[PDB]
Short mmCIF file of N, CA, C and O in Angstrom, two decimals:
data_model
loop_
_atom_site.label_atom_id
_atom_site.label_comp_id
_atom_site.label_asym_id
_atom_site.label_seq_id
_atom_site.Cartn_x
_atom_site.Cartn_y
_atom_site.Cartn_z
N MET T 1 -20.75 6.45 -13.41
CA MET T 1 -21.65 6.51 -14.56
C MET T 1 -22.42 5.20 -14.71
O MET T 1 -21.90 4.23 -15.25
N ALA T 2 -23.66 5.19 -14.24
CA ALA T 2 -24.50 4.00 -14.33
C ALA T 2 -25.85 4.33 -14.97
O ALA T 2 -26.27 3.68 -15.92
N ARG T 3 -26.52 5.35 -14.43
CA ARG T 3 -27.82 5.76 -14.95
C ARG T 3 -27.67 6.45 -16.30
O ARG T 3 -26.60 6.92 -16.67
N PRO T 4 -28.78 6.51 -17.06
CA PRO T 4 -28.80 7.14 -18.38
C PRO T 4 -28.65 8.66 -18.31
O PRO T 4 -28.93 9.26 -17.27
N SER T 5 -28.20 9.26 -19.40
CA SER T 5 -28.01 10.71 -19.46
C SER T 5 -28.09 11.21 -20.90
O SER T 5 -29.00 11.95 -21.26
N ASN T 6 -27.12 10.80 -21.71
CA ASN T 6 -27.07 11.22 -23.11
C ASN T 6 -26.90 10.01 -24.02
O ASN T 6 -25.89 9.30 -23.95
N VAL T 7 -27.88 9.78 -24.89
CA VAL T 7 -27.83 8.66 -25.82
C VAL T 7 -28.47 9.02 -27.15
O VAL T 7 -27.88 8.83 -28.21
N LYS T 8 -29.69 9.56 -27.09
CA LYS T 8 -30.41 9.96 -28.29
C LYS T 8 -29.57 10.90 -29.15
O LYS T 8 -28.61 11.52 -28.67
N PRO T 9 -29.93 11.02 -30.43
CA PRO T 9 -29.22 11.89 -31.38
C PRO T 9 -29.44 13.37 -31.08
O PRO T 9 -30.58 13.84 -31.04
N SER T 10 -28.35 14.09 -30.86
CA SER T 10 -28.42 15.52 -30.56
C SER T 10 -27.03 16.11 -30.37
O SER T 10 -26.05 15.40 -30.13
N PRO T 11 -26.93 17.44 -30.50
CA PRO T 11 -25.65 18.15 -30.34
C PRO T 11 -25.16 18.15 -28.90
O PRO T 11 -25.87 18.56 -27.99
N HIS T 12 -23.93 17.68 -28.71
CA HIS T 12 -23.33 17.63 -27.38
C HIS T 12 -21.81 17.56 -27.47
O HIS T 12 -21.24 16.50 -27.72
N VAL T 13 -21.16 18.70 -27.25
CA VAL T 13 -19.70 18.77 -27.31
C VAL T 13 -19.12 19.15 -25.95
O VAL T 13 -19.59 20.09 -25.31
N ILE T 14 -18.09 18.43 -25.53
CA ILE T 14 -17.44 18.69 -24.25
C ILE T 14 -16.62 19.98 -24.31
O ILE T 14 -16.53 20.62 -25.36
N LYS T 15 -16.02 20.34 -23.18
CA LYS T 15 -15.20 21.55 -23.10
C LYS T 15 -14.36 21.55 -21.83
O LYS T 15 -14.26 22.57 -21.14
N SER T 16 -13.75 20.41 -21.53
CA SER T 16 -12.91 20.28 -20.34
C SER T 16 -12.28 18.90 -20.27
O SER T 16 -12.72 17.96 -20.94
N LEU T 17 -11.23 18.77 -19.47
CA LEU T 17 -10.53 17.50 -19.31
C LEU T 17 -11.41 16.47 -18.62
O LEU T 17 -11.62 15.38 -19.13
N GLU T 18 -11.93 16.84 -17.45
CA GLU T 18 -12.80 15.94 -16.69
C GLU T 18 -13.93 15.40 -17.57
O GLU T 18 -14.18 14.20 -17.59
N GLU T 19 -14.60 16.30 -18.28
CA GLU T 19 -15.70 15.91 -19.16
C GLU T 19 -15.27 14.79 -20.10
O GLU T 19 -16.06 13.89 -20.41
N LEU T 20 -14.03 14.85 -20.56
CA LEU T 20 -13.49 13.84 -21.47
C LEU T 20 -13.31 12.51 -20.75
O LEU T 20 -13.96 11.52 -21.07
N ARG T 21 -12.41 12.49 -19.77
CA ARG T 21 -12.13 11.28 -19.01
C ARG T 21 -13.42 10.68 -18.45
O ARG T 21 -13.52 9.47 -18.25
N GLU T 22 -14.41 11.54 -18.20
CA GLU T 22 -15.69 11.10 -17.67
C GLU T 22 -16.50 10.36 -18.73
O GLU T 22 -17.03 9.28 -18.48
N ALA T 23 -16.58 10.95 -19.92
CA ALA T 23 -17.32 10.35 -21.02
C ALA T 23 -16.74 8.99 -21.39
O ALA T 23 -17.44 8.12 -21.92
N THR T 24 -15.45 8.81 -21.12
CA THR T 24 -14.77 7.56 -21.43
C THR T 24 -15.11 6.48 -20.41
O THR T 24 -15.03 5.28 -20.69
N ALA T 25 -15.50 6.91 -19.21
CA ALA T 25 -15.86 5.98 -18.14
C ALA T 25 -17.26 5.41 -18.35
O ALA T 25 -17.58 4.33 -17.87
N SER T 26 -18.09 6.16 -19.07
CA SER T 26 -19.46 5.73 -19.34
C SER T 26 -19.49 4.32 -19.92
O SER T 26 -18.61 3.94 -20.70
N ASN T 27 -20.50 3.55 -19.55
CA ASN T 27 -20.64 2.19 -20.03
C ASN T 27 -21.57 2.13 -21.24
O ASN T 27 -22.34 1.19 -21.40
N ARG T 28 -21.48 3.15 -22.09
CA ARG T 28 -22.31 3.22 -23.29
C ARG T 28 -21.44 3.21 -24.55
O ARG T 28 -20.24 2.97 -24.49
N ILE T 29 -22.07 3.49 -25.69
CA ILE T 29 -21.36 3.51 -26.96
C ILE T 29 -21.07 4.95 -27.40
O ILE T 29 -21.95 5.63 -27.92
N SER T 30 -19.84 5.39 -27.18
CA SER T 30 -19.43 6.74 -27.55
C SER T 30 -18.22 6.71 -28.47
O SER T 30 -17.24 6.01 -28.21
N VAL T 31 -18.28 7.49 -29.55
CA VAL T 31 -17.18 7.55 -30.51
C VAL T 31 -16.46 8.89 -30.42
O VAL T 31 -16.89 9.88 -31.01
N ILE T 32 -15.35 8.92 -29.69
CA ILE T 32 -14.57 10.13 -29.53
C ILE T 32 -13.75 10.43 -30.78
O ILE T 32 -13.02 9.57 -31.28
N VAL T 33 -13.88 11.65 -31.29
CA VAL T 33 -13.16 12.06 -32.48
C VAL T 33 -12.31 13.30 -32.21
O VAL T 33 -12.80 14.31 -31.71
N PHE T 34 -11.03 13.22 -32.55
CA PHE T 34 -10.11 14.33 -32.34
C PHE T 34 -10.08 15.25 -33.56
O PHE T 34 -9.80 14.81 -34.68
N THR T 35 -10.37 16.53 -33.34
CA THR T 35 -10.38 17.50 -34.42
C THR T 35 -10.48 18.92 -33.88
O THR T 35 -11.21 19.18 -32.92
N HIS T 36 -9.74 19.84 -34.50
CA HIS T 36 -9.75 21.24 -34.07
C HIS T 36 -9.93 22.17 -35.27
O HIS T 36 -9.64 21.82 -36.41
N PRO T 37 -10.44 23.38 -35.00
CA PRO T 37 -10.67 24.39 -36.05
C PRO T 37 -9.37 24.94 -36.62
O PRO T 37 -8.97 26.06 -36.30
N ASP T 38 -8.72 24.15 -37.47
CA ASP T 38 -7.47 24.57 -38.09
C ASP T 38 -7.30 23.91 -39.46
O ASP T 38 -6.28 23.27 -39.73
N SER T 39 -8.30 24.07 -40.31
CA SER T 39 -8.26 23.49 -41.65
C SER T 39 -9.53 23.83 -42.43
O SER T 39 -10.60 23.26 -42.19
N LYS T 40 -9.41 24.76 -43.37
CA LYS T 40 -10.54 25.18 -44.18
C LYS T 40 -10.79 24.19 -45.32
O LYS T 40 -11.91 23.71 -45.50
N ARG T 41 -9.74 23.89 -46.08
CA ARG T 41 -9.84 22.96 -47.19
C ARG T 41 -10.17 21.55 -46.70
O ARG T 41 -10.86 20.79 -47.37
N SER T 42 -9.67 21.22 -45.51
CA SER T 42 -9.90 19.90 -44.93
C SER T 42 -11.20 19.88 -44.14
O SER T 42 -12.01 20.80 -44.23
N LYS T 43 -11.40 18.82 -43.36
CA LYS T 43 -12.60 18.68 -42.55
C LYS T 43 -13.84 18.54 -43.43
O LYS T 43 -14.96 18.68 -42.96
N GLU T 44 -13.62 18.25 -44.71
CA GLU T 44 -14.71 18.09 -45.65
C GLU T 44 -15.39 16.74 -45.48
O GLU T 44 -16.61 16.61 -45.62
N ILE T 45 -14.59 15.72 -45.17
CA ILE T 45 -15.11 14.37 -44.97
C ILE T 45 -15.99 14.30 -43.72
O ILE T 45 -16.70 13.32 -43.51
N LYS T 46 -15.93 15.34 -42.90
CA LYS T 46 -16.71 15.40 -41.68
C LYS T 46 -18.17 15.03 -41.95
O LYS T 46 -18.77 14.25 -41.21
N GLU T 47 -18.73 15.60 -43.01
CA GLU T 47 -20.11 15.33 -43.38
C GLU T 47 -20.39 13.83 -43.41
O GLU T 47 -21.48 13.38 -43.05
N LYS T 48 -19.39 13.06 -43.84
CA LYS T 48 -19.53 11.61 -43.91
C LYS T 48 -19.97 11.03 -42.57
O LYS T 48 -20.92 10.25 -42.50
N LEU T 49 -19.28 11.43 -41.50
CA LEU T 49 -19.61 10.95 -40.16
C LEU T 49 -20.94 11.54 -39.69
O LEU T 49 -21.69 10.88 -38.96
N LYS T 50 -21.22 12.77 -40.10
CA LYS T 50 -22.45 13.44 -39.72
C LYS T 50 -23.67 12.70 -40.28
O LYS T 50 -24.69 12.58 -39.61
N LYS T 51 -23.54 12.22 -41.51
CA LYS T 51 -24.63 11.49 -42.15
C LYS T 51 -24.83 10.13 -41.50
O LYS T 51 -25.96 9.64 -41.39
N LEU T 52 -23.74 9.51 -41.07
CA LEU T 52 -23.80 8.20 -40.43
C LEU T 52 -24.78 8.21 -39.26
O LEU T 52 -25.39 7.19 -38.94
N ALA T 53 -24.93 9.37 -38.63
CA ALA T 53 -25.84 9.52 -37.50
C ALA T 53 -27.27 9.16 -37.90
O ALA T 53 -28.10 8.87 -37.04
N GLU T 54 -27.54 9.18 -39.20
CA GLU T 54 -28.87 8.86 -39.71
C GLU T 54 -29.07 7.35 -39.79
O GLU T 54 -30.10 6.82 -39.38
N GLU T 55 -28.07 6.65 -40.32
CA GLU T 55 -28.13 5.20 -40.46
C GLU T 55 -28.33 4.53 -39.10
O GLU T 55 -28.93 3.46 -39.00
N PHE T 56 -27.82 5.17 -38.05
CA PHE T 56 -27.94 4.64 -36.70
C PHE T 56 -27.67 5.73 -35.66
O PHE T 56 -26.59 5.82 -35.08
N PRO T 57 -28.68 6.59 -35.42
CA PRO T 57 -28.57 7.68 -34.46
C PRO T 57 -28.52 7.18 -33.02
O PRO T 57 -28.28 7.96 -32.09
N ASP T 58 -28.75 5.89 -32.84
CA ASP T 58 -28.73 5.29 -31.51
C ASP T 58 -27.39 5.54 -30.82
O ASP T 58 -27.30 5.53 -29.59
N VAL T 59 -26.35 5.76 -31.62
CA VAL T 59 -25.02 6.02 -31.08
C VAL T 59 -24.74 7.51 -30.98
O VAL T 59 -25.23 8.30 -31.80
N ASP T 60 -23.96 7.90 -29.98
CA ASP T 60 -23.62 9.30 -29.78
C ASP T 60 -22.27 9.63 -30.40
O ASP T 60 -21.28 8.93 -30.18
N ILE T 61 -22.23 10.69 -31.20
CA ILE T 61 -21.01 11.11 -31.86
C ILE T 61 -20.75 12.60 -31.65
O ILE T 61 -21.48 13.45 -32.17
N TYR T 62 -19.71 12.91 -30.89
CA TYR T 62 -19.35 14.30 -30.61
C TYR T 62 -17.91 14.59 -31.01
O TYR T 62 -17.14 13.67 -31.31
N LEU T 63 -17.55 15.87 -31.03
CA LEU T 63 -16.20 16.28 -31.40
C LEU T 63 -15.42 16.75 -30.18
O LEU T 63 -16.00 17.27 -29.22
N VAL T 64 -14.10 16.59 -30.22
CA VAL T 64 -13.25 17.00 -29.11
C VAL T 64 -12.12 17.91 -29.61
O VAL T 64 -11.53 17.66 -30.66
N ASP T 65 -11.83 18.95 -28.84
CA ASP T 65 -10.77 19.89 -29.19
C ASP T 65 -9.59 19.77 -28.24
O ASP T 65 -9.74 19.89 -27.02
N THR T 66 -8.41 19.52 -28.79
CA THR T 66 -7.20 19.38 -27.99
C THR T 66 -6.98 20.60 -27.11
O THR T 66 -6.28 20.53 -26.09
N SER T 67 -7.58 21.72 -27.50
CA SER T 67 -7.44 22.96 -26.74
C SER T 67 -7.75 22.73 -25.26
O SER T 67 -7.22 23.42 -24.39
N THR T 68 -8.61 21.76 -24.99
CA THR T 68 -8.99 21.44 -23.62
C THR T 68 -8.27 20.19 -23.12
O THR T 68 -8.01 20.04 -21.93
N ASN T 69 -7.94 19.30 -24.05
CA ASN T 69 -7.24 18.07 -23.71
C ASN T 69 -6.00 17.88 -24.57
O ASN T 69 -5.90 16.96 -25.38
N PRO T 70 -5.02 18.78 -24.40
CA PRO T 70 -3.76 18.74 -25.15
C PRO T 70 -2.88 17.56 -24.75
O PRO T 70 -2.34 16.86 -25.61
N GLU T 71 -2.74 17.35 -23.45
CA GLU T 71 -1.93 16.26 -22.94
C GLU T 71 -2.41 14.92 -23.48
O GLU T 71 -1.62 13.99 -23.69
N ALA T 72 -3.72 14.82 -23.71
CA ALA T 72 -4.31 13.59 -24.24
C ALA T 72 -3.58 13.13 -25.50
O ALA T 72 -3.28 11.94 -25.65
N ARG T 73 -3.31 14.06 -26.40
CA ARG T 73 -2.63 13.75 -27.65
C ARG T 73 -1.30 13.05 -27.37
O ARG T 73 -1.12 11.89 -27.74
N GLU T 74 -0.38 13.75 -26.72
CA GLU T 74 0.93 13.20 -26.41
C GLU T 74 0.79 11.94 -25.54
O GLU T 74 1.66 11.08 -25.55
N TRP T 75 -0.31 11.86 -24.81
CA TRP T 75 -0.57 10.71 -23.94
C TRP T 75 -0.42 9.41 -24.71
O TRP T 75 0.04 8.40 -24.17
N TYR T 76 -0.82 9.42 -25.98
CA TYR T 76 -0.73 8.24 -26.82
C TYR T 76 -0.01 8.55 -28.13
O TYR T 76 0.05 7.71 -29.03
N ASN T 77 0.53 9.76 -28.22
CA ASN T 77 1.25 10.18 -29.42
C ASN T 77 0.42 9.93 -30.67
O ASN T 77 0.50 8.87 -31.28
N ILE T 78 -0.38 10.93 -31.04
CA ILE T 78 -1.23 10.82 -32.22
C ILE T 78 -0.63 11.58 -33.40
O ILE T 78 -0.17 12.71 -33.26
N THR T 79 -0.65 10.95 -34.57
CA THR T 79 -0.11 11.56 -35.78
C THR T 79 -1.22 11.97 -36.74
O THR T 79 -1.08 12.92 -37.50
N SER T 80 -2.33 11.23 -36.69
CA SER T 80 -3.47 11.52 -37.56
C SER T 80 -4.57 12.23 -36.79
O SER T 80 -5.37 11.60 -36.10
N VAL T 81 -4.60 13.56 -36.91
CA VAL T 81 -5.61 14.36 -36.23
C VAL T 81 -6.95 13.65 -36.19
O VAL T 81 -7.52 13.39 -35.13
N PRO T 82 -7.48 13.32 -37.38
CA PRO T 82 -8.77 12.63 -37.52
C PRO T 82 -8.70 11.18 -37.04
O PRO T 82 -8.64 10.25 -37.84
N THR T 83 -8.71 11.00 -35.72
CA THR T 83 -8.65 9.67 -35.13
C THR T 83 -10.02 9.23 -34.63
O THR T 83 -10.93 10.04 -34.48
N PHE T 84 -10.16 7.93 -34.37
CA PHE T 84 -11.42 7.38 -33.88
C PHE T 84 -11.19 6.49 -32.66
O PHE T 84 -10.57 5.43 -32.76
N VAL T 85 -11.69 6.93 -31.51
CA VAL T 85 -11.54 6.17 -30.27
C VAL T 85 -12.88 5.65 -29.78
O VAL T 85 -13.87 6.38 -29.75
N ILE T 86 -12.91 4.38 -29.40
CA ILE T 86 -14.13 3.75 -28.90
C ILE T 86 -13.92 3.13 -27.53
O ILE T 86 -12.96 2.39 -27.31
N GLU T 87 -14.82 3.44 -26.60
CA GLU T 87 -14.73 2.91 -25.24
C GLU T 87 -15.95 2.07 -24.91
O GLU T 87 -16.94 2.06 -25.65
N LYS T 88 -15.89 1.36 -23.78
CA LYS T 88 -16.99 0.51 -23.34
C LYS T 88 -16.78 0.06 -21.90
O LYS T 88 -15.71 -0.42 -21.54
N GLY T 89 -17.82 0.20 -21.09
CA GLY T 89 -17.73 -0.20 -19.69
C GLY T 89 -16.67 0.56 -18.93
O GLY T 89 -16.26 0.16 -17.84
N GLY T 90 -16.22 1.68 -19.51
CA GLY T 90 -15.20 2.48 -18.86
C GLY T 90 -13.80 1.95 -19.09
O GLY T 90 -13.06 1.71 -18.14
N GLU T 91 -13.44 1.75 -20.36
CA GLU T 91 -12.13 1.23 -20.71
C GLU T 91 -11.95 1.18 -22.22
O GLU T 91 -12.91 1.14 -22.98
N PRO T 92 -10.68 1.18 -22.67
CA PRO T 92 -10.34 1.14 -24.09
C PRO T 92 -10.67 -0.21 -24.72
O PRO T 92 -10.25 -1.26 -24.22
N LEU T 93 -11.42 -0.19 -25.82
CA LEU T 93 -11.80 -1.41 -26.51
C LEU T 93 -11.09 -1.51 -27.86
O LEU T 93 -10.69 -2.59 -28.28
N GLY T 94 -10.93 -0.37 -28.53
CA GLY T 94 -10.27 -0.35 -29.82
C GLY T 94 -9.88 1.05 -30.26
O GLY T 94 -10.16 2.02 -29.55
N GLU T 95 -9.24 1.15 -31.41
CA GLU T 95 -8.82 2.44 -31.94
C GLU T 95 -8.38 2.32 -33.40
O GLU T 95 -7.80 1.31 -33.80
N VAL T 96 -8.67 3.35 -34.18
CA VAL T 96 -8.31 3.36 -35.60
C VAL T 96 -7.57 4.64 -35.97
O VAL T 96 -7.82 5.71 -35.40
N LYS T 97 -6.65 4.53 -36.92
CA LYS T 97 -5.86 5.68 -37.36
C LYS T 97 -5.86 5.78 -38.88
O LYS T 97 -5.02 5.18 -39.55
N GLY T 98 -6.82 6.53 -39.42
CA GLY T 98 -6.91 6.69 -40.86
C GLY T 98 -8.33 6.95 -41.33
O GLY T 98 -9.29 6.61 -40.65
N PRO T 99 -8.46 7.56 -42.52
CA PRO T 99 -9.77 7.87 -43.10
C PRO T 99 -10.52 6.62 -43.55
O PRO T 99 -10.26 6.08 -44.62
N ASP T 100 -11.45 6.17 -42.72
CA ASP T 100 -12.24 4.99 -43.03
C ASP T 100 -13.67 5.12 -42.50
O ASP T 100 -14.13 4.28 -41.73
N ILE T 101 -14.35 6.19 -42.91
CA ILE T 101 -15.71 6.43 -42.47
C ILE T 101 -16.62 5.26 -42.82
O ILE T 101 -17.62 5.01 -42.15
N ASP T 102 -16.27 4.54 -43.88
CA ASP T 102 -17.05 3.40 -44.32
C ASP T 102 -16.78 2.18 -43.44
O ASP T 102 -17.71 1.52 -42.97
N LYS T 103 -15.50 1.89 -43.23
CA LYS T 103 -15.10 0.75 -42.40
C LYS T 103 -15.48 0.98 -40.94
O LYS T 103 -15.57 0.03 -40.16
N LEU T 104 -15.70 2.24 -40.58
CA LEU T 104 -16.07 2.59 -39.22
C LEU T 104 -17.37 1.91 -38.81
O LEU T 104 -17.67 1.76 -37.63
N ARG T 105 -18.15 1.50 -39.81
CA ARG T 105 -19.42 0.83 -39.56
C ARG T 105 -19.20 -0.61 -39.11
O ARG T 105 -20.15 -1.32 -38.78
N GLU T 106 -17.94 -1.04 -39.12
CA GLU T 106 -17.60 -2.40 -38.72
C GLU T 106 -16.93 -2.42 -37.35
O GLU T 106 -16.90 -3.44 -36.67
N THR T 107 -16.40 -1.27 -36.95
CA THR T 107 -15.73 -1.15 -35.66
C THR T 107 -16.74 -0.94 -34.53
O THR T 107 -16.59 -1.50 -33.44
N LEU T 108 -17.76 -0.13 -34.80
CA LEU T 108 -18.79 0.15 -33.81
C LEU T 108 -19.87 -0.93 -33.83
O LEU T 108 -20.57 -1.15 -32.83
N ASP T 109 -20.00 -1.61 -34.96
CA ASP T 109 -20.99 -2.67 -35.11
C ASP T 109 -20.69 -3.83 -34.16
O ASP T 109 -21.54 -4.22 -33.36
N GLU T 110 -19.48 -4.37 -34.26
CA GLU T 110 -19.07 -5.48 -33.41
C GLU T 110 -19.18 -5.11 -31.94
O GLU T 110 -19.30 -5.98 -31.07
N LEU T 111 -19.13 -3.82 -31.65
CA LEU T 111 -19.21 -3.33 -30.28
C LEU T 111 -20.66 -3.04 -29.90
O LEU T 111 -20.99 -2.91 -28.72
N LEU T 112 -21.53 -2.94 -30.90
CA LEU T 112 -22.94 -2.67 -30.67
C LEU T 112 -23.69 -3.94 -30.30
O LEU T 112 -24.32 -4.02 -29.25
N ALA T 113 -23.60 -4.95 -31.17
CA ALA T 113 -24.27 -6.22 -30.94
C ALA T 113 -23.91 -6.78 -29.57
O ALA T 113 -24.71 -7.47 -28.93
N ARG T 114 -22.69 -6.49 -29.11
CA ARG T 114 -22.22 -6.97 -27.82
C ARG T 114 -23.11 -6.44 -26.69
O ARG T 114 -23.59 -7.21 -25.86
N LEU T 115 -23.32 -5.13 -26.68
CA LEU T 115 -24.15 -4.50 -25.65
C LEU T 115 -25.63 -4.73 -25.93
O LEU T 115 -26.32 -5.39 -25.16
N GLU T 116 -26.11 -4.19 -27.04
CA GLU T 116 -27.51 -4.34 -27.43
C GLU T 116 -27.68 -5.48 -28.43
O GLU T 116 -28.74 -6.10 -28.49
#
């Protein structure tokens, strides 16, 4: 993953293991979020992250379903479905566990100025 492909703001959701591990290898700014269709009352805060795309659409934000990457969960033992994973240059840079859509603007920021 060297040349450009997906960066601009637009709908793009994976659907396979390779697609996941691949997106993590990319040397761009991608925010992987774990979430599955199993909560009607919940998933309300989702809009929060959706709106963030406006403040800075330069970043790509997609959703991931364990249905395709189940082992991934146990891979790091996740307790908070709504997790936030950030990669860079094809490697783990950081990770957060908890509802902090507001503070999330500080995790990707420090990682943004670095690249751009």
